[PDB]
């Protein structure tokens, strides 16, 4: 969620400057709110990415079963060994 | 930026020592400020990721089509679209 | 760590409903150590991401070989180890 992030970004600077400008502790707090946004945004994006990962991962495995089914050197036991790892690691 | 993120967030790490120690109202807007710039870094970080999963997205579709052309095509089928359906996601 | 994030954060939207509740110094502090703690969670989380897009790479890597262990065609292989070489640089 690239584009999201950015956006909050920016909002982040300004409202990071107008704290600066201004100190308060409403301002300051209001500021904290905008950060756990970020953070939310952030976290959203990166369980994200690994959904998209596990995914990568089992189009993987169907490419070694298709390796397997012509004849790849029985090499495809070191690699389907790596997505097992890559499995339990997500 | 994994390596810039670690000097970063130790960057954080002291800050938030600092400002306990003498909290102040400027002592606390400069420890915002810094998680500012922490977020940047990470925001900054998952651009990059981003873009790595589609680069692999891309070898994968190349993978597949050379499988592909060497003969499966009902797998062939399952895979790319997989395939299209994670160059969705990004 | 993507379970840990998810908890981290609901700590903190926590923090953040008491401090707005009550502002005050010490709860301003506090709210802002639980974000360091949720960043020092995140960069952690983010790490094991690219310790994971190592591994898809080798995967790959691995995949490639073995397509021209069994005849792929080498102009189609030699594109696919190069974007193979530019990730790996990219890491």
Do not use: C, F, H, W
């Not at 969620?1 to 209001?30: A, F, H, M, W």
């Not at 976290?43 to 169907?62: P, Y």
């Not at 004849?71 to 097992?84: F, N, P, T």
Request: a negative charge; aromatic letters at 2%; charged letters at 35%.
């Amino acid at each position: 969620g690239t584009e999201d992030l950015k956006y909050s970004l920016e909002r982040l600077r300004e409202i990071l400057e107008r704290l600066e400008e201004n100190p308060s502790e409403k301002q300051i707090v209001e500021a904290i709110r905008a950060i756990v946004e970020n953070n939310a945004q952030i976290v959203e994006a990166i369980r994200a990415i690994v959904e998209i990962l596990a995914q990568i991962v089992e189009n993987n495995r169907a490419i070694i079963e298709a390796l397997e089914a012509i004849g790849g050197d029985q090499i495809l036991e070191e690699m389907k060994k790596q997505l097992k790892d890559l499995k339990r690691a997500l």
